[PDB]
């Protein structure tokens, strides 16, 4: 590891035991009939500006 045993806390990987189907529904994002985040981008959207 490289770390001192004594300062450590068992932890959990949310991103593991997940169905690919729900994986996409947590991290992936697109402009395809989506753009739901713009409801949160507040305050300030851009919107979408230019590429990048």
């Amino acid at each position: 590891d490289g770390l001192d045993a004594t300062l450590v806390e068992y932890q959990v990987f949310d991103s593991l035991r997940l169905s690919t189907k729900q994986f996409e529904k947590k991290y992936r994002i697109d402009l395809m009939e989506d753009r739901s985040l713009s409801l949160y981008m507040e305050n300030s959207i851009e919107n979408d500006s230019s590429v990048q």
């Binding site: 507040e42 305050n43 300030s44 851009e46 919107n47 500006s49």
Partner: protein, 75 residues
Amino acid sequence: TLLRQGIRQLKEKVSKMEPEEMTVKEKKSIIEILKARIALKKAFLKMALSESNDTVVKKEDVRESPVDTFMENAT
């Protein structure tokens, strides 16, 4: 400079009290980043200061005086 027109132009960019505001005003905040670095364009001083530069001017206004006098001694 650009800021000078940018005051009068950011003036009425605002659109009512409605959430029509921030939808444009976040990109306006991006413009505020841009102008924030326009401040960098003026990051250092040239000639001193008004009126100390103006004191330099009046200094020239005294310095101009010999110029208007020695010619009288042309003959």
